Design an enzyme around this catalytic site. Sequence first.
Site, PDB file in Angstrom:
ATOM      1  CE  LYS A   1      58.063  43.436 114.246  1.00 59.85           C
ATOM      2  NZ  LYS A   1      57.772  42.928 112.896  1.00 59.85           N
TER       3      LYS A   1
ATOM      4  CB  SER B   1      59.634  45.014 118.596  1.00 57.69           C
ATOM      5  OG  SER B   1      60.731  45.455 117.837  1.00 57.69           O
TER       6      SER B   1
END
Length: 386
Positions: free
Chosen positions: A320, A295
């Site tokens: 992600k 992320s």
Amino acid sequence: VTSEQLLFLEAWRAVDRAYVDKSFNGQSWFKLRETYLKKEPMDRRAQTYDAIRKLLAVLDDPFTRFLEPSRLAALRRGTAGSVTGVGLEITYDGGSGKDVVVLTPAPGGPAEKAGARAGDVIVTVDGTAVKGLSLYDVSDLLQGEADSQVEVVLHAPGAPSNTRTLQLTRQKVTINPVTFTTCSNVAAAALPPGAAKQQLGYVRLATFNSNTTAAAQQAFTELSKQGVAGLVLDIRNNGGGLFPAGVNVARMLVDRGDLVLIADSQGIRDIYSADGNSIDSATPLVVLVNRGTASASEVLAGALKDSKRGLIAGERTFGKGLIQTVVDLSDGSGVAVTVARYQTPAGVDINKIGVSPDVQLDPEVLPTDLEGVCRVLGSDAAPRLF
């Protein structure tokens, strides 16, 4: 139109409005709504909730989910007080079979202490099979009162038979976002080209949270001051977290250019660029990442690589790249919708692809503790970071 129907419609509308893919996975969104209104039972509240969950499932997006009031509330408080876990960050399989995996273990957390690694597959939690459940539900299974125990059965990535049973005791986990040191007498193997000092700055950035920015700024400031030959930014096993802290971090190292694009089916919706607030854009930089890097961390890594600010060393990150927003519904329940995705300055998706290393290395060669890091860096066995 009933109150139940209206509520249903808020959930439908939240997605119609904000979903990342305005083609809705090839479904006619509006028609669907009308069909559900006609065909789905929404006599009781619980039926409404079931109709909403059903509706969301059609998107084939496991991050897009419905939250009942109590869950929403609880999600909010999170792991603050009384509510504890086992130091596991979870997510769905990178190729998703709806398998629940360990995105990354919290350093010094129960699971990490019990040998758990990023990429391990969670099979059962207290005997309950997790495959396919909501991450919101799985977390519920993993959390509990401090001092309580939970059984977690896991196996090695791509080794369903290589399982281990852990009896973890729930406890408050406290991840210190940043630690930094100066490594002296660094092996020649580990130094950037043309280094005029056998000294490297090491910054371990374990989490992106509210404390990250301040700690990181002090570290780079200090290291810059000492005139280290290179910087080593360690974001392995960093689940990301606070997006804006990742942006702050990138800003400390890059003077100019784009850091991250925010995209969806319509195109680029937003962009974050360097603001001329650097701390250190000149010292040679190497960034350590692994499959536990996700992320905001991936966002950071991609910004640094794309801009050519630093080299990426280690192993390909998680991939992600999606972003979800929780939309509140009139009755206190909520929908979590995937609204967008992260892309590198190069317009490449973080999702699925992740960030690739320029320099491939065994992600376990370097420790994460300051003493141990320097040890290895000065050793005859120092990685060729640069």
